[PDB]
Every structure is written in C-alpha cells, then in structure tokens.
Structure 1
C-alpha cells in the first residue's frame, strides 16, 4: 500500500504517471487517460486509489491551494 501526496493550485490541471499499466482506478472524479501512460485531472483536495496487478494499492492524495 504505497501512499502518494502532492500539492496543486486550485483549478489548474495536473498530469501524473500511472503506477501500473492497467489496474483499476477509484476516485471522486472521472479518469482522464492520455498518451504515454499518463492520467490528468483537475486540482482539488481529494483522495483516490489504484489497484495494480502486482498487489500494490497506490493511494493518492492531492491538496489544493489558492
């Protein structure tokens, strides 16, 4: 269960690398995949998760600042 943390500016987009190829995503907003195995999303204080095939649950938490 590898945790993540990051601070972003409110409104601005945030692109991040996928912790695994496929896996299953679970968050409070739709999953926006892009090329080169990346996913983007809007900045807002929140937490989501990825379940990867290797058995590692990648938890993500974003903190929004103005």
Structure 2
C-alpha cells in the first residue's frame, strides 16, 4: 500500500509528471499545478510530496534538485 518514487531534476526547471492514480489526493510542500492528461507540473527543488489513492495505495515522491 506504500510505493516510493525518486527522481532527479535540474533545479529551477519545470518538471512534468503523470498522476499515479485518477483523482487522487495530494499533499506536498508546493501548490498543486494540475494539467491535462492526468498530469501535473512543479518547479524542481529538493522536496517530498505524496498522493493518496482510492485503492489504498499511497505514493511518496522525492525529487532531488541538482545543478547544471
């Protein structure tokens, strides 16, 4: 019921991710930026956020911001 995601991105750039599940609930350090096609956008910074899904699965994401 607990899945972990980890990915690196270039600090300052915009990251586009696919929602892990339809109409899931989100919680994180930055406001949610919903987009079309079950996706969402966020500015790359070292942070953590999570989604709670209807099937009981919780997805925790960790973004590692890096230079260059």
- The interval holding the TM-score normalised by the smaller chain is over 0.9
- The Cα RMSD (Å) is 0.4
**CA displacement at 1:23 relative to structure 2:** 1.3
Structure 1: which 5+ runs fail to align? none
**CA displacement at 1:42 relative to structure 2:** 0.2
Higher strand share: 2
Structure-2-length-normalised TM-score = 0.95
For 2:35 and 2:51, how far apart are their aligned partners in 1? 16
| Residue in 2 that maps onto 1:25 | 26
Deviations 1:5-31 (A, max 9, x none): 000001000000001110110000000
| Residue in 2 that maps onto 1:3 | 4
Question: 1:49 and 2:46 equivalent?
Answer: no
Structure 1 runs (4+) greater than 2 angstroms displaced: none
For 2:34 and 2:61, how far apart are their aligned partners in 1? 16
* Equivalent residues, number: 66
